[PDB]
Amino acid sequence: GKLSEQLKHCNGILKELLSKKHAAYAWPFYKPVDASALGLHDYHDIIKHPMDLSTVKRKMENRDYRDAQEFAADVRLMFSNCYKYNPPDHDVVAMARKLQDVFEFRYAKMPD
Numbered sequence: 361g362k363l364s365e366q367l368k369h370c371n372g373i374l375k376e377l378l379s380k381k382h383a384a385y386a387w388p389f390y391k392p393v394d395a396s397a398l399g400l401h402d403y404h405d406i407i408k409h410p411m412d413l414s415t416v417k418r419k420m421e422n423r424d425y426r427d428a429q430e431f432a433a434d435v436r437l438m439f440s441n442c443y444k445y446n447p448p449d450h451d452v453v454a455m456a457r458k459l460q461d462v463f464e465f466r467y468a469k470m471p472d
C-alpha cells in the first residue's frame with residue numbers, strides 16, 4: 361500500500377514532467393548534460409553527481425527507488441546542479457525554477 365502508492369504518485373509526477381504539457385521548459389532536463397558537446401569543460405569539476413529525468417526514469421523502471429523521499433532527492437539534485445553550475449539569470453535557471461514549481465506543488469499532494 362503506502363510505499364507502492366507513494367511511488368505510484370512519484371511515477372505520475374515523473375510522467376507529467378516528461379509530458380508535452382511542460383516540454384517548453386522541461387527539455388533541458390530530459391537527458392544528461394553532455395558537457396563535452398556544449399564545451400562545458402568545468403561541468404564535471406563543479407557537479408560531482410549529475411542527474412536528469414532519463415536517469416530518474418531508468419531508476420523508477422528498475423525499481424531502484426525504495427520510497428518517495430529517494431525519488432524526490434534525485435529530482436531536487438537535478439535542479440540543485442542547475443542552480444549550482446549556471447548564473448542565476450541564465451534561461452536554463454528560469455526553466456529549472458518553472459519545472460521545480462510543477463514538481464514541488466504536485467509532490468506536496470503525496471498520499472499519506
Ligand SMILES: CNC(=O)CN(C[C@@H](C)c1ccccc1)C(=O)c1cc(C)c(=O)n(C)c1
Nearest residue numbers: 387388389392393394398441442445446452
Ligand atoms: C538537449 N540539449 C540540452 O539539453 C542543452 N542544455 C540546455 C541549454 C539551454 C544549455 C546549454 C549550455 C549551457 C547551459 C544551458 C543542456 O545540456 C544543459 C542542461 C542543464 C540542466 C544545465 O544545467 N546545463 C548547464 C546544460
